[PDB]
Amino acid sequence: MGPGFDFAQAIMKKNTVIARTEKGEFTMLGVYDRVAVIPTHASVGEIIYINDVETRVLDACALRDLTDTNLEITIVKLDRNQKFRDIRHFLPRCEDDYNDAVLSVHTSKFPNMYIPVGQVTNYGFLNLGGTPTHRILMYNFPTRAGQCGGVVTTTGKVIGIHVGGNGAQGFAAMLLHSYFTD
């Protein structure tokens, strides 16, 4: 509908796949080469389904900060025959607050879904499903089951992936450029 939705659509059309684990279907953001991200509560194993194709997992790493606190991001390398467009230049370098973000989801349950969530706060610490979690972004939208792994963007930046909510607020794990130096 406007330039925020334009940037979000461009990311969804080229840099997302539908990932299925034993814990459900998730929006999965491809970042570069065969490297993608998913919430850690997806519990990625040795095999994952990518757009309904059985795919070997070459590596999976559940990220933690240097206080050894959960970040809720798992970086997955996929045994896939095709690379993602490299979008690492759209990742923020530092923890920040943002205006006018869009949360975008693409699954069997929620195809081509886009939500203007408005202002995004650097919330920091969250007890997420009983797990102490750092680098959380917060937005005042009543997000629901089915939206985990959803991509949070502003114009020109990919800032986070949706990892939970409390019925009134939604929460995303930060994406930082430093996670994807190779």
mmCIF file of C-alpha atoms in Angstrom:
data_model
loop_
_atom_site.group_PDB
_atom_site.id
_atom_site.type_symbol
_atom_site.label_atom_id
_atom_site.label_comp_id
_atom_site.label_asym_id
_atom_site.label_seq_id
_atom_site.Cartn_x
_atom_site.Cartn_y
_atom_site.Cartn_z
ATOM 1 C CA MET A 1 0.000 0.000 0.000
ATOM 2 C CA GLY A 2 3.066 2.333 0.540
ATOM 3 C CA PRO A 3 6.939 2.218 0.494
ATOM 4 C CA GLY A 4 7.200 0.135 3.738
ATOM 5 C CA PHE A 5 4.977 -2.577 2.219
ATOM 6 C CA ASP A 6 7.031 -2.297 -1.057
ATOM 7 C CA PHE A 7 10.309 -3.160 0.775
ATOM 8 C CA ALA A 8 8.580 -5.962 2.812
ATOM 9 C CA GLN A 9 7.104 -7.546 -0.373
ATOM 10 C CA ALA A 10 10.525 -7.434 -2.106
ATOM 11 C CA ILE A 11 12.054 -9.383 0.840
ATOM 12 C CA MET A 12 9.157 -11.891 0.982
ATOM 13 C CA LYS A 13 9.156 -12.585 -2.802
ATOM 14 C CA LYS A 14 12.886 -13.545 -3.041
ATOM 15 C CA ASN A 15 14.259 -14.223 0.508
ATOM 16 C CA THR A 16 11.612 -16.455 2.259
ATOM 17 C CA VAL A 17 10.786 -20.180 2.215
ATOM 18 C CA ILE A 18 8.214 -22.165 4.171
ATOM 19 C CA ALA A 19 10.100 -24.290 6.748
ATOM 20 C CA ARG A 20 8.426 -27.298 8.443
ATOM 21 C CA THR A 21 9.854 -29.028 11.559
ATOM 22 C CA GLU A 22 8.140 -31.421 14.055
ATOM 23 C CA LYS A 23 7.082 -28.207 15.944
ATOM 24 C CA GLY A 24 5.158 -26.681 12.949
ATOM 25 C CA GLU A 25 5.310 -24.515 9.804
ATOM 26 C CA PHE A 26 7.435 -21.293 10.044
ATOM 27 C CA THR A 27 8.263 -18.330 7.827
ATOM 28 C CA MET A 28 12.055 -18.703 7.281
ATOM 29 C CA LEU A 29 14.257 -15.786 6.136
ATOM 30 C CA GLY A 30 17.092 -16.653 3.737
ATOM 31 C CA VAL A 31 20.058 -14.248 4.268
ATOM 32 C CA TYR A 32 22.852 -15.307 1.809
ATOM 33 C CA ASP A 33 24.189 -18.454 0.036
ATOM 34 C CA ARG A 34 22.309 -21.425 1.698
ATOM 35 C CA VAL A 35 22.108 -19.705 5.155
ATOM 36 C CA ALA A 36 18.689 -18.903 6.698
ATOM 37 C CA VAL A 37 17.295 -18.046 10.170
ATOM 38 C CA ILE A 38 14.335 -19.443 12.175
ATOM 39 C CA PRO A 39 13.200 -19.093 15.829
ATOM 40 C CA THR A 40 15.135 -21.539 18.083
ATOM 41 C CA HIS A 41 11.800 -22.951 19.432
ATOM 42 C CA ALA A 42 11.312 -24.473 15.882
ATOM 43 C CA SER A 43 13.786 -27.187 17.198
ATOM 44 C CA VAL A 44 15.591 -27.712 13.839
ATOM 45 C CA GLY A 45 17.020 -31.267 13.489
ATOM 46 C CA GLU A 46 19.128 -33.132 10.899
ATOM 47 C CA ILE A 47 16.257 -32.929 8.318
ATOM 48 C CA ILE A 48 13.794 -30.056 7.647
ATOM 49 C CA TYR A 49 11.086 -29.513 4.917
ATOM 50 C CA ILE A 50 11.672 -26.386 2.720
ATOM 51 C CA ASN A 51 8.604 -25.579 0.523
ATOM 52 C CA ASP A 52 7.543 -29.265 1.128
ATOM 53 C CA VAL A 53 10.927 -30.726 -0.084
ATOM 54 C CA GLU A 54 12.932 -32.991 2.289
ATOM 55 C CA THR A 55 16.232 -31.076 2.916
ATOM 56 C CA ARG A 56 19.350 -32.102 4.882
ATOM 57 C CA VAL A 57 20.536 -29.566 7.496
ATOM 58 C CA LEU A 58 24.331 -29.063 7.020
ATOM 59 C CA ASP A 59 24.669 -26.941 10.242
ATOM 60 C CA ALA A 60 22.315 -25.396 12.852
ATOM 61 C CA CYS A 61 23.488 -23.006 15.601
ATOM 62 C CA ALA A 62 21.201 -21.662 18.401
ATOM 63 C CA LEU A 63 22.724 -18.210 19.075
ATOM 64 C CA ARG A 64 23.424 -16.950 22.638
ATOM 65 C CA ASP A 65 25.008 -13.629 23.708
ATOM 66 C CA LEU A 66 28.378 -13.486 25.531
ATOM 67 C CA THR A 67 26.432 -13.541 28.902
ATOM 68 C CA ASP A 68 25.355 -17.072 27.649
ATOM 69 C CA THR A 69 21.703 -15.791 27.420
ATOM 70 C CA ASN A 70 19.306 -17.164 24.748
ATOM 71 C CA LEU A 71 18.849 -14.914 21.639
ATOM 72 C CA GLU A 72 16.038 -17.178 20.158
ATOM 73 C CA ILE A 73 17.713 -17.116 16.656
ATOM 74 C CA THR A 74 18.926 -20.383 15.046
ATOM 75 C CA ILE A 75 21.160 -19.978 11.927
ATOM 76 C CA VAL A 76 20.612 -22.927 9.564
ATOM 77 C CA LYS A 77 22.714 -23.939 6.575
ATOM 78 C CA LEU A 78 20.525 -25.921 4.116
ATOM 79 C CA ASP A 79 21.662 -28.640 1.648
ATOM 80 C CA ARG A 80 19.703 -26.776 -1.061
ATOM 81 C CA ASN A 81 20.572 -26.590 -4.814
ATOM 82 C CA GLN A 82 20.001 -22.790 -5.036
ATOM 83 C CA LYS A 83 21.387 -19.716 -3.184
ATOM 84 C CA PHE A 84 19.410 -16.824 -1.645
ATOM 85 C CA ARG A 85 19.866 -13.283 -2.877
ATOM 86 C CA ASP A 86 22.467 -11.798 -0.470
ATOM 87 C CA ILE A 87 20.551 -9.286 1.774
ATOM 88 C CA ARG A 88 23.247 -8.852 4.505
ATOM 89 C CA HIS A 89 23.626 -5.130 3.488
ATOM 90 C CA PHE A 90 19.995 -4.569 4.761
ATOM 91 C CA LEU A 91 20.881 -5.811 8.332
ATOM 92 C CA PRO A 92 21.438 -3.224 11.101
ATOM 93 C CA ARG A 93 24.896 -3.126 12.712
ATOM 94 C CA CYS A 94 23.670 -2.028 16.219
ATOM 95 C CA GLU A 95 20.745 -2.530 18.663
ATOM 96 C CA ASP A 96 18.216 0.261 17.940
ATOM 97 C CA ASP A 97 14.581 1.456 18.116
ATOM 98 C CA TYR A 98 12.647 1.966 14.828
ATOM 99 C CA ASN A 99 9.561 3.704 13.429
ATOM 100 C CA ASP A 100 6.837 2.348 11.108
ATOM 101 C CA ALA A 101 7.760 -1.376 10.802
ATOM 102 C CA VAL A 102 5.904 -4.151 8.855
ATOM 103 C CA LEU A 103 5.695 -7.791 10.011
ATOM 104 C CA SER A 104 5.372 -10.150 6.980
ATOM 105 C CA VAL A 105 4.373 -13.875 7.143
ATOM 106 C CA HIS A 106 4.082 -16.533 4.444
ATOM 107 C CA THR A 107 2.782 -20.018 5.454
ATOM 108 C CA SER A 108 -0.050 -22.464 4.420
ATOM 109 C CA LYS A 109 -2.177 -20.875 7.235
ATOM 110 C CA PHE A 110 -1.222 -17.196 6.458
ATOM 111 C CA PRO A 111 -0.207 -16.671 2.781
ATOM 112 C CA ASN A 112 0.922 -13.162 1.656
ATOM 113 C CA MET A 113 0.209 -11.603 5.104
ATOM 114 C CA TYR A 114 1.556 -8.086 5.897
ATOM 115 C CA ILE A 115 0.874 -6.191 9.223
ATOM 116 C CA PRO A 116 1.827 -2.536 9.876
ATOM 117 C CA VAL A 117 2.951 -2.831 13.546
ATOM 118 C CA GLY A 118 4.081 0.831 13.970
ATOM 119 C CA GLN A 119 6.794 1.836 16.478
ATOM 120 C CA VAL A 120 9.371 -0.820 17.519
ATOM 121 C CA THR A 121 11.040 -0.506 20.994
ATOM 122 C CA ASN A 122 14.484 -1.919 21.933
ATOM 123 C CA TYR A 123 12.864 -3.853 24.808
ATOM 124 C CA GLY A 124 15.982 -5.895 25.716
ATOM 125 C CA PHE A 125 15.283 -8.576 28.348
ATOM 126 C CA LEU A 126 12.166 -10.792 28.044
ATOM 127 C CA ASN A 127 11.169 -13.977 29.894
ATOM 128 C CA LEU A 128 10.003 -15.731 26.687
ATOM 129 C CA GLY A 129 8.036 -18.938 27.448
ATOM 130 C CA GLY A 130 10.030 -19.188 30.741
ATOM 131 C CA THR A 131 13.450 -18.689 28.977
ATOM 132 C CA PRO A 132 15.478 -15.498 29.817
ATOM 133 C CA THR A 133 16.033 -13.872 26.361
ATOM 134 C CA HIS A 134 18.053 -10.769 25.270
ATOM 135 C CA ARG A 135 17.943 -8.342 22.261
ATOM 136 C CA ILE A 136 14.111 -8.379 22.043
ATOM 137 C CA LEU A 137 12.252 -5.826 19.915
ATOM 138 C CA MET A 138 8.637 -5.021 20.964
ATOM 139 C CA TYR A 139 5.641 -3.697 18.942
ATOM 140 C CA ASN A 140 2.071 -3.011 20.164
ATOM 141 C CA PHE A 141 0.166 -5.435 17.892
ATOM 142 C CA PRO A 142 -1.849 -8.522 19.057
ATOM 143 C CA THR A 143 0.204 -11.120 17.115
ATOM 144 C CA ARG A 144 -1.057 -14.791 17.195
ATOM 145 C CA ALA A 145 0.132 -18.415 16.730
ATOM 146 C CA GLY A 146 1.212 -18.870 13.065
ATOM 147 C CA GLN A 147 3.327 -15.643 12.872
ATOM 148 C CA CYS A 148 6.615 -17.007 14.387
ATOM 149 C CA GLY A 149 9.537 -16.530 11.983
ATOM 150 C CA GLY A 150 7.687 -13.558 10.430
ATOM 151 C CA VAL A 151 10.097 -10.915 9.038
ATOM 152 C CA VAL A 152 10.183 -7.426 10.659
ATOM 153 C CA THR A 153 11.296 -4.679 8.228
ATOM 154 C CA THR A 154 11.418 -0.911 7.849
ATOM 155 C CA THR A 155 12.145 0.832 4.497
ATOM 156 C CA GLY A 156 15.651 -0.416 3.617
ATOM 157 C CA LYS A 157 16.241 -2.551 6.794
ATOM 158 C CA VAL A 158 15.534 -6.172 7.851
ATOM 159 C CA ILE A 159 15.590 -5.762 11.658
ATOM 160 C CA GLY A 160 14.183 -8.948 13.271
ATOM 161 C CA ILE A 161 12.156 -12.182 13.198
ATOM 162 C CA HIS A 162 8.902 -12.613 15.239
ATOM 163 C CA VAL A 163 9.385 -15.075 18.199
ATOM 164 C CA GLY A 164 6.320 -14.505 20.450
ATOM 165 C CA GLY A 165 3.653 -12.310 22.023
ATOM 166 C CA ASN A 166 1.459 -11.823 25.132
ATOM 167 C CA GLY A 167 -1.911 -11.151 23.376
ATOM 168 C CA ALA A 168 -1.432 -7.295 23.328
ATOM 169 C CA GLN A 169 2.314 -6.984 22.316
ATOM 170 C CA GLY A 170 4.495 -8.897 19.799
ATOM 171 C CA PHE A 171 8.214 -9.658 20.261
ATOM 172 C CA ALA A 172 10.986 -10.156 17.669
ATOM 173 C CA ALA A 173 14.638 -11.288 18.020
ATOM 174 C CA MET A 174 17.083 -8.710 16.558
ATOM 175 C CA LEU A 175 19.009 -9.531 13.394
ATOM 176 C CA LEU A 176 22.507 -7.973 13.432
ATOM 177 C CA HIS A 177 25.029 -7.861 10.538
ATOM 178 C CA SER A 178 27.669 -9.471 12.884
ATOM 179 C CA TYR A 179 25.651 -12.750 13.048
ATOM 180 C CA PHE A 180 26.335 -13.395 9.274
ATOM 181 C CA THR A 181 30.048 -12.537 8.757
ATOM 182 C CA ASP A 182 31.537 -15.683 7.043
#
